[PDB]
Structure 1
Amino acid sequence: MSLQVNLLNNTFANPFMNAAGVMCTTTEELVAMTESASGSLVSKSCTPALREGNPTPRYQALPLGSINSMGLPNNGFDFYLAYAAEQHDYGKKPLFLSMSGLSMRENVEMCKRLAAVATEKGVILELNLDFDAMRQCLTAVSEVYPHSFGVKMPPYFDFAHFDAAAEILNEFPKVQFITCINSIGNGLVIDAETESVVIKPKQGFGGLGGRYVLPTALANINAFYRRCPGKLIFGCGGVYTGEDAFLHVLAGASMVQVGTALQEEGPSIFERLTSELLGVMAKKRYQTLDEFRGKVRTL
């Protein structure tokens, strides 16, 4: 049995990594992720300059997941570029750098600079991504960035949008992976005891993660798995156990990202997840991920 994944000219020991934005903002966190049992890691989505993010409380853990409105607090692009160029131990595991410019020009200017470090060191872009705007953004980035990359997608909720999104992404051969999903946007948690919301920004509205999002994540993973047969899918959303991870892979996932559960448990979670996924595979008589990836049975 092996959890090995091979993609983008890399070998990964297992499919697990942190979700962008979770436990990956500081040097300490990035080193902790590298030292963990994870197959890989992705750095906090960056802007050109540092951002303090939204006022606190801006994250709340919940029985069925989490809600947040972080507001992109990050050390700025130079910091994550420097980590990738100078500090990260690529001998330990591959590295993804998440990028989230507040405009198309910001993404373009960051990608111009990332190009050389991707060439020299092998860091892989995950670009945090309105369909017209989307095509134009991908065109602008592809123009200046001479490497494969992936896109982090928000969830969609109908086949019309699955089709439209997939059509655009399929126009761009450099987009070699699609990460499904980012948070279910602008949920509103109300605490019945305090009769109030639980986070401060945006009147309590924030992105939902965890158990809430698993079926939506599976839907998006599988929808894009089917519609973009030329690309890989990275799963993200609602993974707490090796069994959840099994479901991501069955739906089509190559890599499996862990957000909410990692936030609550810390990097030791990857040790648990790898052994649980192996336990699930042994019970089901699978030896490799290739054996069941995308093989979910329809009725």
Structure 2
Amino acid sequence: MLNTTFANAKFANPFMNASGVHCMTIEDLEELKASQAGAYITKSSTLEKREGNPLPRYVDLELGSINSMGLPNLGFDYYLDYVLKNQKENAQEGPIFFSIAGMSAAENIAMLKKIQESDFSGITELNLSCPNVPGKPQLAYDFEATEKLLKEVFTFFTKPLGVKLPPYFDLVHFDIMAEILNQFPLTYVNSVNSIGNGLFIDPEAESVVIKPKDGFGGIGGAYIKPTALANVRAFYTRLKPEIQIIGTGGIETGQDAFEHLLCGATMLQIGTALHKEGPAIFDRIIKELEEIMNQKGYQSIADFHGKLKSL
């Protein structure tokens, strides 16, 4: 009963992995294809293969996780060849999502041109918010640079495109972003990427727990649900209906999923919890969401989607 329509495609359920979790190699991707995830997305890629930051760069926290991966990925070509080959063996219902995170505007345009010129018929996600790349600030916090990039992208990109955004914390920022985004034929916006540059400390050792950037890393998990929900909701009420929303952040139980959908998310991505549990999480959370719906007498997501009530 979780059938979903997103970007003109039908998915068995709205669950996907969040980019960067369990999607580094073809082996990881095949495991997601074999799981009950309704769809899956590749690790954000760059033109050149990258090793990422020094270890340790990821730590499981009681309330979530902190990481500073530094974009380790097997390179743009590796992922493109994989998706193109999978396009031929139609053994999946729905398109695959392809994430790109170029280190500069030039690199993102180059990758998008290649995607546009290829036979790829899936969905592309432009990551404008990686908080863990030393020397590179989050492009999506610079409204002007963001508007400039999107203008150049839409002069040639005609395929489905969505943007992964960092969290915003001021209503006026939502107004400004929504206005910039509403002018483009975007397929979706995905909120949110990690809460950037947080710090976790081991009081006994009196030190940080991750090696890169003096311990500052992206925060995810339970810590960020309040912000994730707010971002999904704030955008749901300001974006033109043509642009759908993928909600990412703090999803660990069917209840968390239910809350994102109530705010207005259509697809849902699980990061930290999937990293901790493995692909079996999809089976568990699908069962949990269905139980919630059963108890409430709901037979489809359309019964409550975007219907969060004010007081």
Query: Smaller-chain TM-score range?
Result: over 0.9
Q: Are the aligned partners of 1:34 and 1:41 in contact in 2 as well (CA < 8 Å)? A: yes
Aligned to 2:47: 48
Cα displacement (A) at 1:229: 3.1
Cα displacement (A) at 1:214: 0.3
Cα displacement (A) at 1:19: 0.3
- One-letter code aligned to 1:224: F
Q: Distance in 2 between matches of 1:177 and 1:51?
A: 27
Q: Distance in 2 between matches of 1:121 and 1:101?
A: 19
Deviations 1:99-141 (A, max 9, x none): 1011111111111111144xx4421001101001101111121
Cα displacement (A) at 1:148: 2.4
- In the alignment, structure 2 segments of 5+ residues that lack a partner are 129-141
Aligned to 2:235: 224
Aligned to 2:112: 111
User: Aligned with 1:42: secondary structure?
Assistant: coil
Q: Are residues 90 and 217 of structure 1, via their aligned partners in 2, closer, same or farther at CA, if it must alter by over 3 Å?
A: farther
Aligned to 2:145: 133
From 177, 186, 192, the equivalent of 1:181 is: 192
Q: Distance in 1 between matches of 2:237 and 2:91?
A: 34
Aligned to 1:97: 98
Q: Are the aligned partners of 2:6 and 2:267 in contact in 1 as well (CA < 8 Å)? A: no
Q: Distance in 2 between matches of 1:109 and 1:20?
A: 20
Q: Distance in 2 between matches of 1:267 and 1:32?
A: 7
Q: Distance in 2 between matches of 1:75 and 1:144?
A: 26
Q: Distance in 2 between matches of 1:31 and 1:128?
A: 23
Report matched runs for 1:18-37 at 5 Å: 18-37=17-36
Q: Are the aligned partners of 1:64 and 1:212 in contact in 2 as well (CA < 8 Å)? A: yes
Over the residues paired in the alignment, what is the CA RMSD in angstroms?
Answer: 1.1
Q: Are the aligned partners of 2:122 and 2:160 in contact in 1 as well (CA < 8 Å)? A: no
TM norm structure 2: 0.93
1:234 aligned onto 2:233: no
Q: Distance in 2 between matches of 1:31 and 1:104?
A: 31
User: Aligned with 1:253: secondary structure?
Assistant: coil
User: Aligned with 1:43: secondary structure?
Assistant: coil
Higher deviation after alignment, 85-94 or 103-112: 85-94
Higher strand proportion (structure 1 or 2): 1
Deviations 1:179-212 (A, max 9, x none): 0000000000001122111100000000000000
Q: Distance in 2 between matches of 1:103 and 1:223?
A: 28
Q: Distance in 1 between matches of 2:191 and 2:296?
A: 25
- One-letter code aligned to 1:52: E
Q: Are the aligned partners of 1:108 and 1:144 in contact in 2 as well (CA < 8 Å)? A: no
Cα displacement (A) at 1:265: 0.3
Q: Distance in 1 between matches of 2:301 and 2:36?
A: 18
- One-letter code aligned to 1:57: P
Cα displacement (A) at 1:90: 4.6
- One-letter code aligned to 2:105: M
1:251 aligned onto 2:263: yes
Aligned to 2:162: 150
- One-letter code aligned to 1:99: I
Q: Are the aligned partners of 1:104 and 1:140 in contact in 2 as well (CA < 8 Å)? A: no
Aligned to 2:286: 274
TM norm structure 1: 0.96
- In the alignment, structure 1 segments of 5+ residues that lack a partner are none
Q: Distance in 2 between matches of 1:172 and 1:90?
A: 31
1:288 aligned onto 2:300: yes
Q: Distance in 2 between matches of 1:162 and 1:284?
A: 32
Q: Distance in 1 between matches of 2:258 and 2:90?
A: 27
Higher deviation after alignment, 46-55 or 2-11: 2-11
Q: Distance in 1 between matches of 2:183 and 2:268?
A: 25
- One-letter code aligned to 1:16: F
Aligned residues: 295
Q: Distance in 2 between matches of 1:261 and 1:124?
A: 24
